[PDB]
Design a protein around this nucleic acid. Structure first.
Lengths: 121, 374, 286, 378, 204, 240, 90
RNA sequence: GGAAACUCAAAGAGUGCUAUGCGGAGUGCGC
């Protein structure tokens, strides 16, 4: 239970990273820690992803205290450069958030991912 | 209205008490009048223990007047009627009603107890044990309950088995108060000298030293330290250097003040190995609980411990010729302590000087040893 | 709370008898406080002794149903249990006595070739029991001598027996002529009371546990409660939805009347229909 | 068959005997569920027979922990074996009515002669006695239940969450909101000492302008009688010599010497206040070096305390996003983009030294090196 | 401030207090609140910092009380007949609203009746409404002792006698620093007050 | 953000309307001189020496009870006399407003399971007296029966799909008879498969089989999608 | 009461007449008779709220009537509508 | 014609309130 607790295993990591990639290509993903907490207190955030190898860890560990307050699920993944490549962007991101949108084409995949991570927690 | 039920419960005793010639109806109607008023004030609303007290007082006074007119008119001690037990049994009934309605005040509880003790010529510890049981259950924390119960059934019944049981029960319910631990040790030495002098009586006409007091003293000090350190730092164990060290030394201060009280009213017992048990007390106080009171801090406590270590052998009288024989240990201890202490050297020197000044042809060699000590 | 602990699909055909048991196995302390055992005989030639995980105590923290089955060659109609030593008895084509430790009938008990429509043990002198056969007959059995011991034949068929809890040698037969019969046992030639006021066949009956007020439920859509020493209805209970009420029993505190009908429902009633079931201040009680 | 029940209160344990049994079949009836709301008909069911309060509040928190984990504690053991009668072999097993099936087996193991009931009937009269509450005891307690469970609630919450005792910005926010206010009012009081002593020295105010040295020498020279030395005047400080000459050449001055001692006490009162300042300032320099060391190393103690005060608290500052670390006055184009760089760097530093449970300084140092290498374009 | 200065940590509260600080039925409240206290703990450093602020508050209170005694002695030196009449606090408040002592010596007694209720007076002029009757002078002891609207009447007569005594010890050059005619006017307004409290408009 | 707004008592006691150009909803603060959450406070001056007392604006987009209030509930049970058991108290978002609409006399036992909102909740709770923080899981009211006594309304902002068992166990243990029950139901967190008022019908039926008689429901639609405030009362005796 | 009712006797009437104070709102219909108990009061601003909805120091008109007097575009709308009302009513 | 009370009379509702059940022994059995 160290600090970044709901850390996904390999298969769930890979399916949340591929739904991250198609969300980023659909322009439904907002990336980075402060854009993540900005959309978190805007209220449009379906679930958030945080890379648990950042330098150091607290820079995104501020985000659970907002997200579990506002009742959105949150996952950790093991690698910033994996999240950066999956966001489709050149630098390593550490935090990412799926904006809620009913005009999405990825809605059922989003909901299946959400159900798996909520059963993870 | 159940007041009518009580008021005509009390009719047959006054019926027989009138038909035999001690009262007349013209005054039993008066005592019935005042009894009616008392019963109404009793089982009315918003009543009080003072109403119960005045009812008890009035019924005891009419009981005494009943006995007075019994020995005056009939010239007998009793008339073997219904009345003679009835009036005190309804006094006890009033007491029972008042304890059930108002179990708060130990004053009314205590005078219920005292009346049942004074009736205790006739009545029973079968009756006493029940009211002590329910009083004990309603007040587990109050220590005078356990102490008065132990005093009663040890200074009338002298049942040491039940006294050990209720003292262990009282310490089980609150191992926090010093007074109950203190009087447990007091009862322990009381019956230990009782059976030492009892076997002395057996030895005249024809092992069991203070190890029990030692064991309960040791668990007393451990439990008392735990409960003082838990009385302080109320909800959260404070974690720093100086407040932690100050709380440990404050516990050690209060605990060893309590063991000093144990010593200074332990020496009232003369019919046992008082010096050996005080030596055991100082030996248990020697090794410390995370403080090291002797060489480290609490140096004033270390000084008083050293002076107690000397005076435990130096316990003597004005007729001190055996002290002139055995004060070599005192001089050896004072030398071996002056060779250790730095400014407590001066403190212990002045203290042994004042103690020898309390100790002081037989005064001539005593004057020689006084010049030796000075 | 008025709901079941558990339910089961017990047998294929009808269930014809069931009772409750405090069994004693010779290989177990039978824990009669964390779980609770009933048993039932039925139409498909089987008797089944059944556990129930009951939740009334909290001594513990699992073995729900069918701890053992008995098998008979003919059908079964009735059950009751000797309330000591775990020996129960069944009415079928012939009455069998068996305990819960062995899968064979320990005794045949019948007079001759006639089925046994119901039976009931005693509440005290527990070795004695009664039964009713479709010979329109009452047969008493004693299990000390292991034998039937007397039989009377009446006019119409006796539906159901129930013994007395207090008198211990008086029982009540409910038969199909429209009246119940408070019989003695020691003198079986005069049915020492006849409770009369019904209009159809009286299906069962039991006593109140206080022993002086009995309850009959009948084939007309109405139960009624009798005093013992009158012989006419103290009170009639009926409702529009109950129909053909078959099994009425009396709860063990003499306050409630459980009426299981034919339309499915089982209902609660008060016995004294005007009283209420709260504690009362002594002015109300007086 | 419910003979006793055990009710666990914030002040201590209570054990009630059951005089009359509640009805078992009609327990869902209106007239039975209203008698546990009538008090004068609930006391016909339940008599209080024992009540052992907790000795200390530490033992209150300990018993609350042991009940919440379902364990038996020693005070509970004491009250149970005092009150419950020992039974025979298996006939008439005595019966408690407790409130949970997890406390069931533990006291069953501690007392094999005791049986525990927690059904609807047990929870029914449990919630009856919880509803009526302190009216049952008729004053036989030392404690009020609502304030007692207030204290017990904050204690139990704090011990469950491991809330720290030092990691606390509530010192720092009111410490800085204290010292800026007292800097203001010692400026006010030093100006009042200046205008008061102008009636005795109208000339000294222009020559010695400093407030603290001014008041400290006003405490020194009471009346215009210096006249001889310069040593102590320079020790309070040449300018001393000019003030010494102007004490006898100024003479635009009254005396009021018989009650100038209140000005002498007042100036040293300003001295004691201004010396309480800078030691409070040393205190919060240490407190920002201990609580938010990355903030103290990156931005300094004054801007750090102003930041967490102006935000409201440390956790609120941390959970603020990097753009809403806007402020007025502090964070000292070419200044604008470096202000934004310093802003999100100190928000990141705030996240670090908040959510780290016992923070270090090395990340504050590397943030300082990052922002200085960033502004070194100029 | 005295109870934190005595106490410090609430852990110590079960064994050290004395009931000169506060009455004894509140000390048991203090100890019981110490053991049921929902507060955190602190260190000796911030404990001594707030202890220093506690003694700072105590010292400033003691300084305020000695300043009030200073004000009493100095106004008894300045305008002794005035403070013999009215009171030192209200006299000082009148001089504070005045400016200088001669600057309110050159005033009609009407103004000294209304030298505190300024905006109420001016707004009750502005709208055609009814004026106040006390000014600042309401906090004087004599108009406090009067009860009704005769307290407004005694506010008028105390303004008049205050103007008399005020300009006496203002423009005097050799007055005895004794408050003699101030005391005389005090006896005059006092017997005036009793002979108007004898009045009651309701019949007997 | 600096203009002047009049106050007015609402229908429910304790809560106030602040009518200006637009008209806010507001409550009377317990802890003056502070804003816990980030809301705006309107400060009024009562004229004796004059007092300065402040009123915290209740945000209906951030607290479902304020959504239900200005969506219009016929009655609450959060009166300024009562005691309130707040199941699922996340933060000082809504519990502060429920606290200071209860007032200085009555208690709000707020419960919470998660630890980070719990510790900022107790840091909120040190500043107003009348709330009691609980850091226990709501599924086991046995492990905090020690410290809450006979609350006379329950609010439930718990968002996990065993809501009916949660509110049933807690109301059986601590809610007094004829007491208030206010539920916020979130259909996407109960079950996303079937539609919103189908799950509202399921939860209403589970309430009235747990003999909480439901009097009233509200959809709160212009503020949040697919929630429902259900107000009922614990009947416990004579559901009919 | 009727001692501060002079200062606040206008603003409650215009809050009653909010329906036509600005031609972009259409507040929903209620009568709003003047209540028996009320209190004026000003907002104070969140300390993180800055640059966004805080009114400045010299911009804080100390009455809602003065704040409404402030913007001359609103007063221009008042002027043009009252002028067309006057010419259509004469 | 409107307004003071310890003016009284009559109803109603709420809060409380507890509303509130031969004997010492000894002698053999009752686990």
């Amino acid at each position: 239970n160290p600090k970044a607790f709901p850390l996904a295993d390999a298969a769930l990591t890979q399916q949340i990273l591929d739904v991250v990639q198609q969300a980023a290509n659909l322009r439904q993903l907002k990336k980075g820690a402060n854009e993540a907490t900005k959309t978190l207190n805007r209220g449009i955030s379906e679930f958030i992803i945080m890379a648990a190898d950042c330098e150091p860890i607290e820079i995104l560990l501020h985000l659970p205290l907002l997200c579990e307050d506002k009742n959105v699920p949150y996952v950790f993944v093991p690698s910033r450069v994996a999240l950066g490549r999956a966001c489709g962007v050149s630098r390593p991101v550490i935090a990412a958030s799926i904006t809620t949108n009913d005009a999405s084409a990825i809605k059922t995949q989003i909901y299946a991912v959400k159900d798996k991570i909520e059963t993870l927690l | 209205s159940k007041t009518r039920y009580y008021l005509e419960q009390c009719i047959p005793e006054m019926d027989d008490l009138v038909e035999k010639g001690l009262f007349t109806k013209n005054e039993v109607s008066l005592i019935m009048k005042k009894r009616t008023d008392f019963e109404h004030r009793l089982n009315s609303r918003g009543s009080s223990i003072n109403d119960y007290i005045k009812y008890i007082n009035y019924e005891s006074n009419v009981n005494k007047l009943r006995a007075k007119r019994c020995k005056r008119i009939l010239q007998v001690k009793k008339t073997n009627s219904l009345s003679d037990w009835s009036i005190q049994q309804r006094i006890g009934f009033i007491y029972q009603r008042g304890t059930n309605k108002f179990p708060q005040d130990l004053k009314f509880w205590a005078m219920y107890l005292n009346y049942m003790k004074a009736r205790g010529n006739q009545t029973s510890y079968k009756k006493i044990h029940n009211i002590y049981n329910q009083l004990l259950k309603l007040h587990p924390t109050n220590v005078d309950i356990w102490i008065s119960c132990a005093k009663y059934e040890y200074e009338v019944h002298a049942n040491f088995k039940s006294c050990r049981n209720i003292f262990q029960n009282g310490l089980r319910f609150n191992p926090d108060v010093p007074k109950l631990w203190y009087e447990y040790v007091k009862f322990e030495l009381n019956f230990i000298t009782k059976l030492i002098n009892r076997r002395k009586v057996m030895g005249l006409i024809n092992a069991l030293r203070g190890d029990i007091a030692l064991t309960i003293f040791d668990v007393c000090m451990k439990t008392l330290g735990k409960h003082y350190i838990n009385k302080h730092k109320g909800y959260y164990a404070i974690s720093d250097s100086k407040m932690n060290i100050e709380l440990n030394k404050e516990t050690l201060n209060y605990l060893f003040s309590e063991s000093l009280r144990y010593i200074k009213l332990f020496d009232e017992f003369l019919d046992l190995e008082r010096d050996y048990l005080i030596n055991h007390v100082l030996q248990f106080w020697k090794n410390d609980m995370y403080d090291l009171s002797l060489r480290k801090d609490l140096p004033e406590l270390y000084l008083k411990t050293v002076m107690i270590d000397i005076t435990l052998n130096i316990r003597y009288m004005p007729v001190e010729k055996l002290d002139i024989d055995q004060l070599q240990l005192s001089v050896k201890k004072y030398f071996a302590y002056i060779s250790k202490l730095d400014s407590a050297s001066v403190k212990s020197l002045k203290n042994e000087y004042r103690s020898y000044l309390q100790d002081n042809a037989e005064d001539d060699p005593r004057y020689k040893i006084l010049d030796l000590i000075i | 709370t008025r709901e079941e602990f558990v339910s089961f699909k017990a047998h294929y055909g009808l269930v014809t008898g069931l009772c409750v048991t405090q069994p004693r196995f010779h290989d177990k302390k039978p824990d009669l406080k964390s779980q609770n055992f009933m048993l039932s005989c039925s139409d498909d030639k089987t008797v089944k002794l059944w556990s129930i995980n009951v939740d009334d105590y909290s001594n513990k923290n699992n073995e729900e149903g069918l701890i053992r089955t008995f098998d008979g060659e003919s059908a079964f109609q009735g059950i009751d249990s000797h309330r000591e030593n775990s020996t129960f008895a069944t009415g079928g084509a012939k009455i069998h006595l068996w305990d819960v430790n062995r899968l064979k009938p320990v005794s045949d008990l019948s007079w001759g070739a006639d089925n046994i429509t119901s039976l009931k043990f005693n509440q005290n002198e527990t070795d004695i029991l009664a039964s009713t056969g479709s010979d329109n007959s009452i047969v008493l059995y004693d299990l000390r001598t292991n034998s039937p011991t007397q039989k009377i034949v009446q006019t119409m068929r006796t539906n159901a027996i129930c013994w007395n809890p207090m008198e211990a040698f008086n029982f009540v037969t409910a038969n199909e002529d429209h009246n119940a019969y408070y019989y003695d046992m020691r003198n079986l030639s005069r049915s020492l009371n006849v409770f009369k006021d019904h209009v159809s066949a009286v299906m069962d009956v039991d006593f109140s546990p206080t022993g002086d007020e009995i309850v009959t439920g009948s084939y007309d859509k109405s139960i009624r409660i009798y005093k013992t020493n009158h012989g006419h209805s103290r009170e009639i209970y009926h409702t529009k939805r109950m129909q053909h009420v078959f099994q009425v029993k009396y709860s063990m505190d003499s306050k409630y009347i459980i009426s299981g009908s034919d339309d499915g429902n089982v209902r609660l009633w008060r016995s004294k229909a005007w009283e209420r079931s709260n504690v009362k201040t002594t002015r109300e009680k007086n | 068959p419910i003979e006793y029940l055990l009710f666990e209160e914030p002040t201590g344990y209570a054990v009630f005997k059951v005089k009359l049994q509640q009805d078992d079949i009609g327990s869902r009836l209106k007239e039975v569920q209203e008698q546990i709301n009538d008090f004068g008909a609930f006391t016909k069911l339940i008599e209080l027979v024992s009540f052992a309060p907790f000795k200390g509040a530490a033992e209150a928190l300990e018993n609350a922990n042991d009940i919440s984990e379902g364990l038996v504690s020693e005070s509970l053991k004491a009250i149970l074996d005092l009150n419950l009668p020992k039974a025979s072999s298996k006939k008439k097993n005595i019966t408690l009515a407790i409130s949970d099936k997890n406390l069931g087996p533990s006291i069953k193991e501690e007392f094999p002669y005791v049986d525990c009931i927690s059904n609807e009937l047990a929870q029914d009269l449990i919630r009856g006695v919880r509803l009526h509450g302190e009216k049952l005891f008729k004053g036989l307690q030392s404690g009020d239940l609502e304030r007692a469970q207030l204290g017990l609630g904050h204690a139990y919450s704090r011990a469950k969450v491991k809330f720290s005792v030092q990691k606390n910005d509530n010192h720092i926010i009111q410490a800085i909101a204290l010292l800026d206010q007292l800097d203001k009012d010692i400026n006010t009081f030093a100006m009042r000492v200046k205008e008061w002593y102008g009636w005795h020295f109208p000339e000294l105010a222009k020559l010695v302008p400093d407030n603290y040295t001014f008041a400290k020498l006003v405490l020194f020279i009471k009346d215009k009688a210096s006249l001889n030395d310069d040593s102590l005047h320079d020790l309070a400080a040449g300018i001393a010599q000019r003030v010494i000459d102007n004490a006898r050449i100024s003479m635009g001055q009254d005396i009021s010497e018989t009650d100038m001692e209140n000005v002498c006490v007042f100036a040293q009162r300003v001295a004691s206040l201004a010396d309480y300042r800078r030691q409070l300032y040393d205190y919060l320099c240490e407190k920002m070096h201990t609580v938010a060391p990355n903030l103290s190393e990156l931005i300094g103690e004054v801007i750090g305390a102003r930041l967490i005060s102006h935000a409201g608290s440390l956790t609120n500052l941390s959970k603020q996003a990097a753009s809403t670390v806007q402020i007025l006055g502090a964070e000292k184009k070419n200044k604008g983009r470096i202000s934004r760089y310093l802003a999100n760097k100190c928000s990141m530093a705030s996240r670090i030294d908040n959510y780290s449970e016992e923070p270090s300084n090395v990340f504050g140092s590397v943030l300082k090196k990052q922002v200085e290498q960033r502004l070194e374009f100029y | 401030a005295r109870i934190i200065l005595t106490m410090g940590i609430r852990s110590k509260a079960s064994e050290t207090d004395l009931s000169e600080i506060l009455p004894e039925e509140i000390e048991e409240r203090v100890k019981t609140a110490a053991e049921v206290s929902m507060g955190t703990e602190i260190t000796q450093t911030d404990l001594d910092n707030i202890n220093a602020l506690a003694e700072q508050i105590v010292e400033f209170a003691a300084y305020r009380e000695q300043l009030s005694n200073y004000l009493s002695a100095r106004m008894k030196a300045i305008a002794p007949n005035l403070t013999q009449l009215v009171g030192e606090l209200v006299g000082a408040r009148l001089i504070a609203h005045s400016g200088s002592l001669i600057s309110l010596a050159k005033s009609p007694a009407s103004t000294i009746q209304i030298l505190g209720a300024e905006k109420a007076l001016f707004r009750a002029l502005k709208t055609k409404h009814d004026t106040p009757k006390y000014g600042l002078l309401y906090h004087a002891s004599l108009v406090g002792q009067a009860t009704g609207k005769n307290k407004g009447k005694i506010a008028r007569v105390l303004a008049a006698k205050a103007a008399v005594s005020l300009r006496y010890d203002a423009l005097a050059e050799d007055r005895d620093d004794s408050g003699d005619i101030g005391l005389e006017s005090r006896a005059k307004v006092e017997n005036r007050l009793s002979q108007l409290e004898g009045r009651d408009l309701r019949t007997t | 953000g600096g203009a002047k707004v009049v106050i007015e008592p609402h229908r429910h006691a304790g809560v106030y309307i602040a009518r200006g150009k637009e008209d806010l909803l507001v409550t009377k603060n317990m802890a003056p001189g502070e804003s816990v959450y980030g809301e705006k406070r309107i400060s009024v001056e009562e004229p004796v020496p004059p007092t300065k007392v402040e009123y915290r604006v209740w945000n209906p987009f951030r607290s479902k009870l304020a959504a239900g209030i200005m969506g219009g509930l016929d009655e609450l049970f959060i009166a300024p006399g009562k005691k309130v058991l707040y199941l699922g108290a996340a933060s000082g978002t809504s519990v502060s407003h429920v606290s200071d609409v209860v007032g200085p006399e009555g208690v709000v036992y707020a419960v919470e399971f998660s630890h980070r909102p719990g510790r900022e909740l107790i840091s909120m709770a040190k500043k107003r007296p009348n709330i009691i923080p609980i850091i226990e899981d709501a599924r086991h009211p046995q492990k905090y029966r020690m410290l809450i006594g006979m609350v006379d309304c329950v609010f439930a902002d718990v968002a996990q799909p065993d809501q009916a068992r949660i509110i049933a166990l807690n109301s059986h243990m601590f809610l007094k008879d004829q007491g208030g029950v206010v539920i916020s139901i979130k259909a996407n967190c109960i079950d996303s498969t079937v539609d919103a008022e189908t799950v509202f019908a399921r939860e209403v039926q589970k309430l009235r089989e747990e003999r909480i008689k439901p009097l009233e429901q509200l959809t709160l639609e212009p503020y949040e999608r697919d929630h429902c405030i259900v107000v009922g009362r614990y009947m416990r005796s004579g559901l009919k | 009461d009727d001692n501060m009712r002079r200062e606040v006797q206008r603003d409650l009437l215009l809050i009653k007449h909010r329906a036509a104070l600005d031609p972009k709102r259409h507040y929903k219909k209620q009568r709003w008779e003047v209540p028996e108990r009320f209190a004026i009061g000003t907002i104070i601003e969140d300390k993180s709220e800055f640059y966004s909805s805080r009114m400045n120091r010299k911009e804080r008109k100390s009455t809602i009537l003065e704040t409404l007097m402030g913007d001359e575009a609103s007063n221009k709308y008042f002027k043009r509508k009252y002028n067309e009302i006057q010419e259509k009513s004469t």
